[PDB]
Each structure stands twice: as C-alpha cells, then as structure tokens.
Design a protein around this motif. Structure first.
Motif, PDB file in Angstrom:
ATOM      1  N   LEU A 162       0.898  -1.167   0.013  1.00  0.00           N
ATOM      2  CA  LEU A 162      -0.094  -0.051   0.035  1.00  0.00           C
ATOM      3  C   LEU A 162       0.789   1.223  -0.002  1.00  0.00           C
ATOM      4  N   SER A 166       0.738   4.125  -2.793  1.00  0.00           N
ATOM      5  CA  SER A 166       0.239   5.127  -2.680  1.00  0.00           C
ATOM      6  C   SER A 166       1.424   6.412  -2.713  1.00  0.00           C
ATOM      7  N   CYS A 502       5.605  -4.397  -5.494  1.00  0.00           N
ATOM      8  CA  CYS A 502       4.362  -5.206  -4.925  1.00  0.00           C
ATOM      9  C   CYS A 502       4.516  -6.768  -5.276  1.00  0.00           C
ATOM     10  N   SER A 551      -2.437  -4.916  -8.167  1.00  0.00           N
ATOM     11  CA  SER A 551      -1.661  -3.638  -7.994  1.00  0.00           C
ATOM     12  C   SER A 551      -1.711  -2.668  -9.262  1.00  0.00           C
ATOM     13  N   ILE A 554      -4.917  -1.133  -8.430  1.00  0.00           N
ATOM     14  CA  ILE A 554      -4.976  -0.210  -7.588  1.00  0.00           C
ATOM     15  C   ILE A 554      -4.242   1.097  -7.823  1.00  0.00           C
TER      16      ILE A 554
END
Lengths: 565, 565
Positions: A162, A166, A502, A551, A554
């Motif tokens: 995450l 981000s 990731c 991933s 996201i």
C-alpha cells in the motif's frame, strides 16, 4: 580594477589558442558597456572572463557568444549576496539534521539558485524522506512488537504494498506536477543547453526516432541475456566453492566469483556502450543532447537493474526453492576430479538475510564512499604520483603575474574547481535519481526480509540529503541564471519498480511465510530433502500474476483519484 | 405570414399551461425584431414557435430562454437550403454504396450539420469499414485458398491480432485526435446542453466523485456474479435437456433456457438500474448530464458485456475443454428421476460453429431489426389498438384552425416527429458506439472460428452506415446550430476489447489448432473419453498471460510511435 570589486555574475572560459584571431579583443569589444576582467585560466590556452552582466545586456551578449562558437562554457557565477544566502541556507539545513527537511527550505533554494533540476531532485528526496518516516516507524513496530515473527509478515507486506503504490501515485500526480509547474514558472535560461543545441533545425522525424529506439530492444535483450548467463555462472561457481568443495582454502576462494563478476560487468558495460549504445544513439540523431543522454540512460539501466537485483532474485527464486534437487544424483551427473563432498546438499537458510543486509547496509555505505570520497582520493593520489600530473602548472605563475588578492584567488580557484574538479561538475540529475531509485527498488522488493530496512534507508537518505545539498549548493557548477535570457525516464522506472516490488513482496510473503525452512518466516529433521515451499510453482506464478493485476488496478485507481484533484 | 416564407431556423416548443402567465405573449415580446410564427403544437398544452434567428440576436435570445426555464426544448431546424444540401449528400451516399464511404463526404457532413457527435461516430464507422476491407480480403483468402483447416489458423490469428492492435492504436492516436481537433474547431452551441446544465456552480469535488464511482465496483461485481451464475445455470439446463435427457419433446424444450435467460436478463437489468445504478449515479452528484449518462453507460456495460460474450466463452473454455469429465460417474453422482441417457456424454463438436454463426450473422440481423423496424411496428400497433392512443384529437383541431398549407404541414409534422417519434429522437452516440463495439468484440475475439466474419461485418457495416447516415441526417432531431451562441468511455472499451480479443484469439488458436476433436482445427474412435486439448490448463493460462503481456507491449509501442507523429 579587482575581481572582488567587480563582483562577477558570470564567467566565460574560452580558448586563446587562436592568437591570430585574438579572441580576447573580440570578447572585449563585444562588452562595450559592461565592465569585465579577463585573466589567464587554469590551462595554458584558456582564460577566464569575469563579467557583471545584468537583465539588460544579457540576450545580445549571449547571442554573440553563441555566434562566436569558440566558448568552452558559460558559468553563472554566484555573487557575494547569493553566496551568502546559500551559505545561510546550508547552515540552517545543518541545524535540525535529525528533523525531516522542511519544504519552505526547498522554496528558498529554488528561489535562490533558480535550478529546476536541483529543486526537482531535492523535492523527490524530501518527499521520499517524509514518506519513509511512517514506513520506518511501522517497520520498527513490526520488528520489535512481533519479535521473532518479523520475517515475511503479512501485515508488513500489506503495508509495504500500500505504501509503495500510494507513494508512487502521490509523487507522480500530486507533488511532481506541483514542482514541474513551479519550476517551469521560472524556466530560466540554461547555459548547458546553449553552446550545445545550436542550429536546432530539428524536424528529426520523432516517429523514425521512436522506431530506431525499438531497434535497440534486441541488443538490450542480447546483452541482458549475456549478463544474466554470466551471473548465473558466477552464482553456480560460488555455490560449488562454498558448499560442495573440499579445498584447503575455501575461505580465500569464495571471493573468486565476486572478483569475476566485478571484473566482467565493467568490461561488458564498456563494450556495450562503445559498440552499441553510443553508435545507435548517434544513429537515432537526437535533436537535443538531453534527449540523447536520456536515451543512453535508458539503454544502460538494463545492465544496472540486472547487476543490482539478480543476486537476490536468484537466491529467493532459484536457490532456496530448488535446493533439494541438487541433493539428488544431479551432482554426480554433472571434470577435474576436485575434492567434493558426497553428503547431502543443504541450502544456506540465512543466505537471503546476509544478502539483503549487504545490499541495504554495506552496499549503501560502499556506494556513498564511491560517490563522495573516492574521486577526492583518486585526485590526491594522482597529484602525489605526479605533482604537475597534467604538467600544465601555470597556477603559481599566474598568481605571480596577476598579483591577485585573497578574494581574487578564491574566485579564480572556484572557477578552476568548476572546470577541473570532479565535485565541481554540473549537477547530475540522472545519477542521483538513479541511485535513489536503486535504493527504492531494494526497499520495495525485499524489505519483507528485514522490516528495519525503511529505517536504514531513512537515516541514509537524511545524511545523503544533507551531503547532496551541501555539494550542489556550494561546489557544483551553476547552470541557471537568476534572470531569463532568450523527470521522464525515472518516472517510468519508479512505476515499474513499484509494480515489481508489490509483485515480489507479495510473492515472497506467499512462499516464505509458512515454508518448511527452519527459522524462515513463522514456525522435521530431514527438511532439506523435500520441497521447502508449501505451494507449487503453478500457485506461485499464478499468485504473482494475480498480485500484478491487482497492483496495476489499485495504482490506476489511485492515479485517477489524484489526477482528478 | 406563412411558415414557408418565414423559413424557420429554429423551433421553440414550450408549455402554454400557464395561460395566466401568457407564455406566448412574453415569448413574443422578447423577439421584438426577429419575426416568428407561433402555432399550437402536437399536445394541447404545448405550442411551437418558428423563428428565423441569426448570428446577431442569438446570444440574448438564448439567455432569455434559459432564464425563462419553462422551455421544453430548442430545435435547430434545418432551413430549405440546408435540407436540400443534406438531401443531396444522402443521394450521393446512396450512389456507390458498394464502394467504401469517402472522407470528403464526412467533411461535407460535418460542415453542414456542425454536429461533433455525428461526425465522430461516422468517422469511427468509416475508419472501421476501411480497416475491415483488407481484413475481409485476408479472411476470404484464408477461407478459400487454404480450403480446409481454415479454423484456428495460425496465419489468420497472427493477422487478426496485428490488425486489432494496429487499428485500435491508429484510431486512438491518429484519427480520433484529428477528428476531435476538427470538431472542437466548430465547438458550436449545443441546445441539449442548455436548459439542462443551468446554474452550473460545479465545484463538485471530482475526487469525491471518483471515490463514489469506486463504491459501485462491489455492486457491479455482485450483479455480474448473479448474472454469470444464472447464465451458467441456464447453460447447464440446456446441456441437460439436449444431451442427457430422454423426453418426448426435447425439440420444444430446448428453447426453455433461451426463454429463461431472455426473461431474467431484462428483469435483472431493470432491478439493477432502478435500485443501484440510478440512485448511486444521483449520489455521485455529477455537474453535467453528459457525465451522468457516461457513468450510467459504464455501469450498465458490465451486464451487456456478460450477456454478449459469456455463452461463447462458456462453450470455448468450459464445455469443450471439460466434457470428458461429465461422461464419468459425475452424472450419476448428481432428483425427479427424469428419463436420462446412461450412455457416454459426447460434446457437440459443432457447438462453437453454430454459436459464432448465430452471434455474427443472425444476431446482427436481429439487432438491426430491433433498432430499425421494431419501434415503427410498435408505434403502428399502438395506433391500431387505439387510434388516438394518447387521445390527442387536438392535432386535427390545430390543422383546422390554422389552415396550414402543404409546406406548413410538412414543417409542423417534422417538429411533431422530432418531439414524439422514436426515430426523430436526438442522435444517440452511446447506443451506436456500443453496438459497433459489441460487433468489434465478437470479431476480434472469436473470428478465428470463422475467417469470413470480417466480410460479414464489412457488409453489415456498409448497410448500417448507409441507414444510420440517412436516419441521422434526415430524421434525427438536430442538436447543433450553424453559428456559435455563447469519446471517453468507448475508447477504454475499445482498448479493453482489443487486448481481450488478442488474448482470446491466441489462446483459442493454442488450444484448438491441434486438438483431438475430429473436424476442429487441423487434423481415435473414443476421443471423447480423453482430454480434447493437448495442452494442460497450466500451459493455457500461462500462454494467455504471456500473450496479454506481449499484446500490451505491442500496443504501447504502437501508441508511442503514433503519438510521436
């Protein structure tokens, strides 16, 4: 007149080899109204022109200099007030080193130097530190609260994935656009672009350039395959020496694969650049030198990526998962009749730990020393071996002839350091961004092995920010002027590193959280004869693909949300 | 004065319910200098206002109309000269129907109607036809020159993948930007946007809107899962009826699953829209109605995609690959004691052929009839059941009281058809683009089953282009004005369809080119008891993932090459 009273804002270093043309008078008569002092330079055939240009006589003087086409470089020297302001900024930065750097300091630095490259790099570094602080605190919590079960923790891996996604989205769509807009507001005249992009006819058929770039993909694949094959050979030789060899001096011989790889990689890179990267980048016929340098960096990052991440990838995906197979008669199937162990082949259950510790602690210090102390030591050794190693001298004689004062000698030495000293070279955005991205790749792919890696990276980045700010503000050659005179590849590298990190973090947690290796992840006397991983390779590959898709989705959602704002 | 002599340029249809407010009188006083003729409309409480506005009194009149906020709609009526030019264009299009439409005709149409939506849709259609011509010729060559073994041909699949990727990249980065620039050059006043986007305060927190859109992802997943589960149930029931059932009237009963799915899908869509799509799109609080419609289309395309492509996907990835499992004792493991065959379960080796023929030939004709003939038949039936179905009567009263001439009656009937007739509705870019993209998805995912599919699509698209051009130029309600008065989702759908079609084409060629099913692809008496596919599911999935990555890379390279140009 003295240089101190003149207070130069610009230095023109030009060749005086053409004494028939007498470049000095042409340079003097151009500056009919602005006073200047011209002194012999560091070389026998170069001289410095200390000038006091302003907003008014900037464009005509620079157009004449461009037409003159015998100027080595134009240095926007820092005046006394600018130097004092920069020194005050550096002293303020030195205070509160433990605290994260404040972005108002970044505003002040960008206002003073007016350097978009330095401000962009230091904005990335400041954002990196600010994001690393919570990551470091979470890593410390996972390391100490969870105690022994800190390796391949699911909580830490979820937080890391995450955080990576981000951070990358936030930099790409919130902070970098801000800094690009603010630095394009200045978009001041850059001297390095001048005297290098002259007669810019362009019309270079961007489509043909893109097609020529694609023609290098086979070459990059071929050289990557050669490098990967030699890395696999060196890894196999190291495993043979350390594990299944019975020599008297295995402690000495274990350094042989390291020497082999550290000798082969520079030679392969030299051949790669000399015969493929340079000729093909020339054949691409880039309009600007910046684009050519970006193309060379993109071509050369294939080798750097492999040299950086192949060893850990080998250890975590080929060595530990498939180590029980070597125990079988494959060893006896594989000519000098060297003394070899006939016992079972046991994998080094702490190989990944030592490798990651080296790549996140020892390697960082080694690279720091190479980029900071090594050039100065090399220069000192060169001067020791030969006092006048270039045999130019001319320095003490210039002091005697000109009778320069202390401040005049200080300014002359600053210009000489700009021209000759490696630390006085122009700020290299590509190198610093590459080193930061390599550290980021290590951190986002393999930190699940050691949750204290974000903390190490945070401390290293604080020290690196201080050192780089000092070097770029006090020693680097200036490139931008205070007044107008009329990232790219690394963003893609960051995105690819985020997606790959990731994928690798999730996959490593999948395989190693509940593996059969003793002391790896969370909790048989012959465990090494069976498969250490409790998931088949099909499951591992499918999970990696699924995590890659998740991933990407996201990151796309984060990018949409941040782009909307 | 007569309407024919006035030669109206626009028509205002407004409610005269507020006779105490005398909307006719103030509508007249506003138009102090432009002459107009106001007549009672199709309804008892509506009237038409035929005006002859120009570029001078356009902005004030429209601002007053917006402030009036009781105007149903503003129709930019086509004058006699514009109508004659459009009729000439349609007649020219009718000639040389066999030949591909020419882009100069598109230029003329965009110049005349000044409609960016129609011109964009017809540009996409023309590019689609022009690209389908070589695809059709290659498909004919594969079908006839190769004679047999035209199914799952490697040559055809490679050509199809390359054609899909190149066509999508070319449209996205060469033709669509060109047409977007040309149509933003006009960017003329649109009446549909007016009287629907008034008091546009905006400041709707685009980030919050994007977050609310993500909140629908669980709902879309849930309804897609429900629909997919019912589709699987209907497919299982159809297989049970056709294969392992021994009833007297299996020919009649085989239509039961079709009825069940064709009844469940509309009801599920109705519930979906009424309770989730509409309330959540309202909750998103879109500033513009266009954005809300785009959001509704994006939400509703999840159901359309599944309803369109699930049957063929089931046949090609679940029925044929796993049919040897059913003939085992699973059938006896799986309550009404119906008469069932106890013999071996043999897959229908021609199921995919019939299904693709239906979806590429019969379904195209069915959709054409539904979108062209069905509304007119429904209106005729409604008028037959009840002559005055809405109990109008007042149209005849208006005709009698006004004593309109032939041309006046023609113009009044045209306005009435604009307001009431389904074919007179405003041009719907979303519906036409959706139908074209569904045909494109069929063609680029499953045409390796039948190489003549591009030819069928080409003929269908030629006829559809002619019909749609005639309808949009002669019957559709105008939306744009000749003078100024002061694609989006489907691009993403096209890209996703291209990537998915490349993946599915390559995977289908991989499984079925050299399968054990007799008569499938290129060339045992008990073949149905073993695995028909010669590759394990692991190989098929890995190959699909590899082809997905390769296609994404190729599309990225094409996009870069075309964007540089």
């Amino acid at each position: 007149q003295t240089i101190t009273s003149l207070d130069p804002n610009c230095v023109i270093v030009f060749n005086k080899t053409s004494s028939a043309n007498e470049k000095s008078l042409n340079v003097e008569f151009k500056r009919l109204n602005i006073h200047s002092i011209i002194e012999p330079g560091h070389d026998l055939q170069t001289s410095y022109a200390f000038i006091r240009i302003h907003q008014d006589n900037a464009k005509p003087l620079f157009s004449f200099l461009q037409n003159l086409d015998f100027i080595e470089s134009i240095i926007p020297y820092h005046d006394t007030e600018l130097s004092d302001d920069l020194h005050k900024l550096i002293s303020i930065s030195k205070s509160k080193i433990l605290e994260a750097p404040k972005q108002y300091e970044l505003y002040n630095l960008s206002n003073l130097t007016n350097n978009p490259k330095q401000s962009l790099y230091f904005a990335f570094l400041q954002n990196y530190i600010k994001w690393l602080i919570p990551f470091s605190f979470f890593g410390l919590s996972i390391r100490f609260l969870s105690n022994f079960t800190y390796e391949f923790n699911s909580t830490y891996s979820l937080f890391a994935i995450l955080w990576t996604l981000s951070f990358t989205a936030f930099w790409l769509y919130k902070y970098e656009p801000f800094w690009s807009d603010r630095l394009s507001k200045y978009s001041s005249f850059s001297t390095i672009e001048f005297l290098q992009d002259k007669q810019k006819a362009q019309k270079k058929a961007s489509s043909v350039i893109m097609l020529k770039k694609c023609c290098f993909i086979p070459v990059a694949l071929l050289f990557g395959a050669i490098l990967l094959s030699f890395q696999l050979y060196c890894f196999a030789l190291e495993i043979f020496i350390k594990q299944i060899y019975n020599g008297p001096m295995i402690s000495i011989l274990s350094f042989l694969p390291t020497i082999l790889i550290c000798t082969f990689t520079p030679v392969l890179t030299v051949i790669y650049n000399k015969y493929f990267v340079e000729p093909m980048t020339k054949w691409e016929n880039h309009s600007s030198v910046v684009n050519a340098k970006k193309s060379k960096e993109a071509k050369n990052f294939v080798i750097i990526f492999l040299s950086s991440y192949v060893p850990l990838l080998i250890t975590l995906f080929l060595y530990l998962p498939m180590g029980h197979l070597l125990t079988a008669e494959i060893r006896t199937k594989v000519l000098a009749r060297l003394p070899t162990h006939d016992s079972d082949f046991i994998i080094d259950t702490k190989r990944y730990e030592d490798q990651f510790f080296y790549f996140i602690v020892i390697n960082q210090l080694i690279q720091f020393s190479m980029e900071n102390f090594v050039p100065s030591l090399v220069s000192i050794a060169q001067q020791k071996i030969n006092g006048p190693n270039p045999n130019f001298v001319k320095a003490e004689s210039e002091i005697g002839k000109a009778q320069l004062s202390s401040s005049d000698m200080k300014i002359w030495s600053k210009v000489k350091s700009y021209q000759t000293d490696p630390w006085g070279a122009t700020f290299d955005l590509d190198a610093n961004f590459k080193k930061l991205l390599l550290q980021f790749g290590y951190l986002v792919m393999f930190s699940t092995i050691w949750p204290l890696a974000p903390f190490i990276c945070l401390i290293v980045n604080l020290i690196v920010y201080q050192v780089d700010l000092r070097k770029a503000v006090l020693y680097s050659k200036p490139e931008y002027f205070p007044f107008p005179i009329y990232v790219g590849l690394w963003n893609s590298v960051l995105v690819m590193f985020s997606i790959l990190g990731c994928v690798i973090t999730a996959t490593l947690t999948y395989m190693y959280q509940s593996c059969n290796i003793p002391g790896v992840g969370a909790h048989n006397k012959a465990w090494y004869l069976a498969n250490p991983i409790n998931h088949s390779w099909i499951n591992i590959v499918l999970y990696a693909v699924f995590i890659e898709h998740v991933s990407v989705a996201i990151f796309f959602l984060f990018s949409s949300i941040l782009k909307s704002s």
